[model samples]
Target: SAREIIAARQKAEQVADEIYQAGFSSLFFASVGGSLAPMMAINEFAKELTTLPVYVEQAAELIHKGNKRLNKDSVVITLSKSGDTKESVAIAEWCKAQGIRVVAITKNADSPLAQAATWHIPMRHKNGVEYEYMLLYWLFFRVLSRNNEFTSYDRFASQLEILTANLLKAKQKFDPQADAIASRYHNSDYMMWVGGAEMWGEVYLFSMCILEEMQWKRTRPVSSAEFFHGALELLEKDVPLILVKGEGKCRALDERVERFASKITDNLVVIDPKAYALDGIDDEFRWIMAPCVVSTLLVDRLAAHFEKYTGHSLDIRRY
Candidate 1:
């Protein structure tokens, strides 16, 4: 297992540099829901690191709208750790038929996605390759920009090598900011999760799976932009809300939304950016890898911490 992780890291270092100069002008990420959460997170990380104006679209919408943009100048990064996701494979086939360059990152080298991609980047997750999807997707972006204008794998590897140590330090100080709020709303008939598109992938995750399976916490996840349309107006002062924010293009909007929440309830929790203190990450190589991994680490810790409060074991099973 360790060997596979190590091999993936080294291969990531090699492949990421090649794509940075591979003549593609702009990058686009095609992602699916739930199972592809790692892909969504990694795609955002890639956009930040490369500063290349990368566009992200959910597969269903992208299949309808994004098809027009595919061409030689466009690089479509389609990710599915298992490579068997219906939406992903369909998009992959469509992209191929349209003559667009597709780069697939997955563990199954012989899978349809890997076979379809212009380039196949092999990867294995270090933290239990079962969740290899997480790290594989992360590496797809990290390595793609390893030697680019902003962040490079070499730089990220060094920085993460240090942060991984600091994480251990923060590990001992684990705190479940969710439990204190969850305790108050435990008796409520239903809970609504309000966040922006930036947090959509994870919120959907927290809504559909995490809360349902692990903590048995009742909840729903929605984007903040769509919140005012109906959801926000329906909320009472006592209702609890979890607003996940990130250090990305949507931060400003997220802040404005959170301000609005102050008028609603004191029960709001925000997942802040890791590089918040040092004016954020200056280079994409370092910061891109930073927040994504930090977010994941936070979730893992939060799951363990909250499990104690919820009196349940964190359940992980395939759909």
Candidate 2:
């Protein structure tokens, strides 16, 4: 598995070079449902690490808004688990008609979205779609840095050799905590997941996809900065809140919210990936690692716990 993931490096490099030479004015990421999380990360990372203007939107919204900035000189990336998601396929077709470049990330190479795109980055994962998605995205950005004069890409790239192993270890180590959390709050009336910059998308996915969509639980995701603005008022002694803390430029923001939530709610769980040992990963990259890899593993374990205790299969959706 690790070997397969590492083999993706060359493709990532080629894609990065294509993007550079194509000279797009902006990069747009369009996806639907849970697939939007990785694109959100790409958008944020591009803003932080390069001068590129990155825009992320749901495919339907992009189609409805008809953003004029998206033209032949724009590059659009689309994501879908099955590579045939209706909205994403529509967007890919639209990009093709406009002569805009489209990069498709999906689990199948032969799917419609893949066929419609200018380039297809296939992620043939039997599981952990989010982790694999983010890993490939990481490679893309690191190679992109080579063209953008970002010197720290080397540090990040070097550690990726060991990222897969570290992520597996983190998942194994957090298995017990996942069980503990599910045992305590699986039946809670509602949950509020809070996180800062890099973690905001991860929290949103967990709340919307895993907890609500999969487990039939009620949950809401709140950005750490926005928690105080309104969501903090909903906190009470029995209110359950999960605080996702990742090391990043926004760590202080998460910490501040954790401090306040701990005081207001007796049922607060803080999942801090910084506590894990990421053997070969540089300390500086830990912030991005948590949400991208670590938390994905941890939350999957929690989903397992939920199924184990409740006898409710994760894939048993009535929709």
In TM-score terms, which candidate is top? 2
Residues 1-319, candidate 2, lDDT per residue (tens digit)?
A: 6676666655665777777775778788888777877677666666777766678888899988879888788888887878879999999999898888998877788899999999887676674654455555654565468566566776776676677777777788888888898999988889888986777778888789888888998987899988989999999999999988868788899999889988899999989888789897778777666676645664578788987877789888989
Give the 10-residue window scoring lowest on summed lDDT in candidate 1.
125-134
TM-scores of the candidates are: 0.69, 0.95
Cα-based lDDT for every prediction: 0.60, 0.78
The digit string of per-residue lDDT tens for model 1 on 122-193 reads 655334222334344434545455544434445444444344444444444434454554455545556777
lDDT, residue 306, model 2: 80
**Candidate 1, position 135, lDDT:** 43
Give me the runs in candidate 1 sitting further than 4 Å from their true place. Answer: 1-9, 35-53, 64-66, 97-99, 125-148, 151-154, 162-172, 178-188, 197-200, 212-218, 224-230, 248-252, 273-294, 297-319
Q: Give the poorly placed runs of model 2, Cα more than 4 Å off.
A: none
Clash pairs (backbone) in predicted model 2: 247-287
